[PDB]
Amino acid sequence: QELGNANFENFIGATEGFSEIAYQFTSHILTLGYAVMLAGLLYFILTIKNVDKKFQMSNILSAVVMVSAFLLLYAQAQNWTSSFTFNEEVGRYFLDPSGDLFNNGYRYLNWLIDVPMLLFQILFVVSLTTSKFSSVRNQFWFSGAMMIITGYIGQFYEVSNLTAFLVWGAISSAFFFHILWVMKKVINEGKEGISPAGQKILSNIWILFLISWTLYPGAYLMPYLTGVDGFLYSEDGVMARQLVYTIADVSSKVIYGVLLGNLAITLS
Length: 268
Fold this sequence. Notes:
The termini are far apart. The protein has one domain (1-268): Rhopdopsin 7-helix transmembrane proteins (Up-down Bundle). It is mainly alpha-helical. The chain has helices at 8-14, 20-46, 56-83, 105-121, 133-156, 162-191, 196-221, 235-267, and strands at 84-87, 92-95. It contains 8 helices and 2 strands; from the N terminus they run H-H-H-E-E-H-H-H-H-H. Pfam families: Bac_rhodopsin (PF01036).
């Protein structure tokens, strides 16, 4: 299997193919993904006037994240549809040799760019207490970048060497735990010396952040979560993975932005 060696979407597409439902669902979900980013982009442009100058860098960075997310998810969406074509004889969609093939680059690039801005963002709304801005900022940038790069290396091996896919996933996960831990510290310090209404919103932000962000390794693992011959090892694990990525992207970029915007209005 030469054509389907690059990733699980290709593997499936070149061997079993995708039902009508799997192909259409995944296409629609990816389209909702970028459409929400565009709407978010507008929301963040239009509401920047509602926070004090002091906090506006957060709204700016929300907007910038929306731009890159709109572009790269639009591109990922097109890459889905143009990589798989219907075959009349079997009634399924197959990896098209005349296309460019499914490619995770668009999404991994988006993460490299958005992770550092999403993490930095909050440092323009909350005030630290005992920690330094530059230290926190550097810990987030370095660990975020490493998390993504090591996850990108892992994903090459997804079908060729599943063991490696997992080892690199675990290294990536170690960077992830460090980010959660710095973020929990940022949230606790940001709670010190704001109103209880501000603290309740920070509490929500932590929950959102924690769940959102954990969906990413969930979706990386998704086709293996029922074992090497189970139910998700299939087009359904492709559908599940792309659905979960899309929910994660909306939650981590959009809802997170909105919550941060509301925190900043509270502090204004």
